[PDB]
Amino acid sequence: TKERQQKAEAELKELEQKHTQLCEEKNLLQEKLQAETELYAEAEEMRVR
Amino acid sequence: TKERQQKAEAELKELEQKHTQLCEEKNLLQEKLQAETELYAEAEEMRVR
């Protein structure tokens, strides 16, 4: 049981680090959010001009 | 064995939550970001036009 669930523990920890890497990619996605909303403000400004 | 289960079962719930708000919500935000990018590209095209 120790062997099998230690393998399972290692697998779940690797999945945890994968979740952290996808969270970093999500932070990059929010950086895209803010860049796009700034560009949207600029776009609306140019459009009303 | 028990503390390693709690090291894994309480890690498995961590995987579940970080996947539903860091990998699934990541995909939802990715769809939102793609929509925003396409709409801003259309906005900039209208700007130059």
Q: Rounded to 5 degrees, what angle do the CA atoms A23, A24, A26 make? A: 60
B43, amino acid identity? A
Can you give the resolution of this entry in Å? Answer: 4.3
At position B21, the amino acid (one-letter code) is Q
Three-state DSSP string of chain B: CHHHHHHHHHHHHHHHHHHHCCCHHHHHHHHHHHHHHHHHHHHHHHHHC
Q: In B, which residues are within 8 Å of A25 by CB distance?
A: 26
Experimentally, how was this structure solved? Answer: cryo-EM
CA distance B14 to chain A (A): 8
CA distances from residue A47 to A39, B27, B33, B42 in whole angstroms, order as listed: 12, 31, 22, 12
- Mutation to test the B interface, candidates A14, A21, A29, most B Cβ within 10 Å: A29
